[PDB]
Design a protein around this ligand. Structure first.
Ligand code: HEM
Ligand code: HEM
Lengths: 145, 145
């Protein structure tokens, strides 16, 4: 279950998530837009799902993309803040899952975000260990999809 | 105009928002649920819009309501963090506005949250001065609906 997935994140994994978030979460606008632009560059097949945002190739200049990207970073902020209480983490994860289920986003498709996250982490010198930690958090959401 | 509304957030208003947020934002789960339960209690005619959350009278015991409430507080955190840059505040406000326009929420009905905000602030010893500052922030969202 989602609870099981959340109730699997160990102290060491939580430590790595918090340490890396202190850095990538410090520039939500810059890193949020970087995450989305990287997703669109490496997974062009996902561009169609974001038609509400308009021309996503405009990057930072696109107000709707910027607003979406900053907001996405607060969903991650939410998750990081709830790490020590699986019950709370589960209810916020399920809420975000519903927002993606309504858009027909499968667990496999949601997992496409792992590549962009790995690249953004690497830009701040956080290596594979950190990428693996984030994949475990992403897997908690996948358990709800 | 959302831009003219954002211009109403002067130095003094921003300071009052930050100072009060330091307190109410410290307990997102507790104060978030308190905000929602107060809204439902004083404006029963709005409960119909939240059918997805199930039995809202259950308060904290309702997992969907708790998830929704915590997430709502991160939207406010987002707004507070963007007070320095009007261009960024506007794009995150417009993003939130879209989520409410889709649910058929008018500027007038969105404004019903002012009563609950005043009450929650009052319970923490923050008076009308602070309630008025928060009404100005809510007004920016209203301008986008
Ligand atoms: C770290 C992972 C991700 C997080 C935290 C996240 C977060 C969010 C948030 C907060 C929203 C706004 C929800 C709303 O207001 O309705 C959103 C919207 C959306 N997300 Fe994600 N998302 C993630 C990954 C993905 C992936 C990988 C896809 C697609 C392959 C995806 C597709 C969508 C779509 C299509 C929307 C709707 C955009 C719109 O029309 O405004 N998301 N996401
Ligand atoms: C400070 C004021 C408010 C904030 C920051 C706020 C924030 C939010 C957020 C973040 C969501 C989730 C969006 C999504 O994932 O689709 C939401 C949903 C919603 N809001 Fe608000 N909101 C506020 C006031 C109101 C008011 C006063 C009403 C109506 C009288 C309203 C009606 C709704 C409804 C119906 C939903 C959808 C709930 C669901 O089915 O999940 N909101 N709001």
């Amino acid at each position: 279950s989602v609870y099981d997935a959340a109730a699997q994140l160990t102290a060491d994994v939580k430590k790595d998530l918090r340490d890396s978030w202190k850095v990538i979460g410090s520039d939500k606008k810059g890193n949020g837009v970087a995450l989305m632009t990287t997703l669109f560059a490496d997974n062009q097949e996902t561009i169609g799902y974001f038609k509400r945002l308009g021309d996503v190739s405009q990057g930072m200049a696109n107000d709707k993309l910027r607003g979406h990207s900053i907001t996405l970073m607060y969903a991650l902020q939410n998750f990081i803040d709830q790490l020590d209480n699986p019950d709370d983490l589960v209810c916020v994860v399920e809420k975000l899952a519903v927002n993606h289920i309504t858009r027909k986003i499968s667990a496999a498709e949601f997992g496409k975000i792992n590549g962009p996250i790995k690249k953004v982490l690497a830009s701040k010198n956080f290596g594979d260990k950190y990428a693996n930690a984030w994949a475990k958090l992403v897997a908690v959401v996948q358990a709800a999809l």
